Amino acid sequence: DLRLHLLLNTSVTCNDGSPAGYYLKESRGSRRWLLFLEGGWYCFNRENCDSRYDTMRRLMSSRDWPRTRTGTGILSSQPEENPYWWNANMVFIPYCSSDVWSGASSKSEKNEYAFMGALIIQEVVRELLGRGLSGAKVLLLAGSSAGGTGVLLNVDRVAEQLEKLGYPAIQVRGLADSGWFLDNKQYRHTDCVDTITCAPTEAIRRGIRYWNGVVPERCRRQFQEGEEWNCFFGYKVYPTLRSPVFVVQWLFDEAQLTVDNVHPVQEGLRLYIQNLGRELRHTLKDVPASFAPACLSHEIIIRSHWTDVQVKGTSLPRALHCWDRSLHPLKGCPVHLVDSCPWPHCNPSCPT
Numbered sequence: 001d002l003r004l005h006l007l008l009n010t011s012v013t014c015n016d017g018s019p020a021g022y023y024l025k026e027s028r029g030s031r032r033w034l035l036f037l038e039g040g041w042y043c044f045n046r047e048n049c050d051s052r053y054d055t056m057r058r059l060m061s062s063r064d065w066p067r068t069r070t071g072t073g074i075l076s077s078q079p080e081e082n083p084y085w086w087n088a089n090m091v092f093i094p095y096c097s098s099d100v101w102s103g104a105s106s107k108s109e110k111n112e113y114a115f116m117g118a119l120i121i122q123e124v125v126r127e128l129l130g131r132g133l134s135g136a137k138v139l140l141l142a143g144s145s146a147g148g149t150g151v152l153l154n155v156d157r158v159a160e161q162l163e164k165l166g167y168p169a170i171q172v173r174g175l176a177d178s179g180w181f182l183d184n185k186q187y188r189h190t191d192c193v194d195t196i197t198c199a200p201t202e203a204i205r206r207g208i209r210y211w212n213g214v215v216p217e218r219c220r221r222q223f224q225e226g227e228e229w230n231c232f233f234g235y236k237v238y239p240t241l242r243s244p245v246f247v248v249q250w251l252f253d254e255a256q257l258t259v260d261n262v263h264p265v266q267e268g269l270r271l272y273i274q275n276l277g278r279e280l281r282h283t284l285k286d287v288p289a290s291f292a293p294a295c296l297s298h299e300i301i302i303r304s305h306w307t308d309v310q311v312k313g314t315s316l317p318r319a320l321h322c323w324d325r326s327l328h329p330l331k332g333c334p335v336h337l338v339d340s341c342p343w344p345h346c347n348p349s350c351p352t
Ligand SMILES: Cc1nc2ccccn2c1C(=O)NCC(C)C
Pocket: 040, 041, 042, 100, 145, 146, 149, 179, 181, 200, 204, 232, 233, 234, 255, 256, 258, 259
């Protein structure tokens, strides 16, 4: 079990002003630290944030959090479940900011909600440096769904924070799971009039202004004022990053299909789905550390049976182990694994 600590700096808060926090399981004999960002959609105006507060309140508030959580998948301490990093120091950071981990705004006379995701990550790192992170050799910032996009937005800022604090020997790396989206042509189209009809490009542009959202500096300098939404798309922000980042992405991700307004398949939809897989494969062609199976699914790294899926005969825990070796090509230890077959479940190891 990982145990809850609420932040000592209580100005760093969840949406409703309650303190944010982290769950920790130490491993005294290890210099490896895994910090995992939870996912769970987002909200971008008063009315949809109000709805989320009634029926998704654990993603907006720490008031009802349990004192412990069990580590699963890459956060498990058992080698049977986690062949990759079972002996590491484990941290689970709950997502209670509803801002894709980008926000830098407090609740105030003008703001009903606080959007503090970017500041939550920096404050967790700061408090952990007094609980053993100061001795680290490797800090892996990982995350799923909105947390995977959060890795892309925040990994270089963690690297800069640790350098400025006097720890240039800690190697900062990222692992982004199910956070690599395309701003592609949708299968059916609606103008952005409400929550359900608003495509991601439009919803994120509004969200950035509502959250006071922040993006990595080199990407911000490329796209400039009013165009920061582009940095929430992995294939546009990734080439701007300096930290090593491993990208895990299903080729037919359920969340991508949802934002494309896709739910007996006829010719138009068949060609749409095949073109999506091809476009995703294209964006990953020159990403050297990546795992992209031809399955219809969503998230993987904290699933207990994450060991089962394989690309070209290599599992995800093996690929991440090969990545670690590459950062000390390797015979029989590949790091770039992207399926070529063109339809969901053409890989027999896909989740049922
Ligand atoms: C962050 C997220 N969670 C979910 C869950 C279901 C459907 C979509 N999303 C999204 C989404 O639209 N990201 C686009 C962009 C930020 C890369």
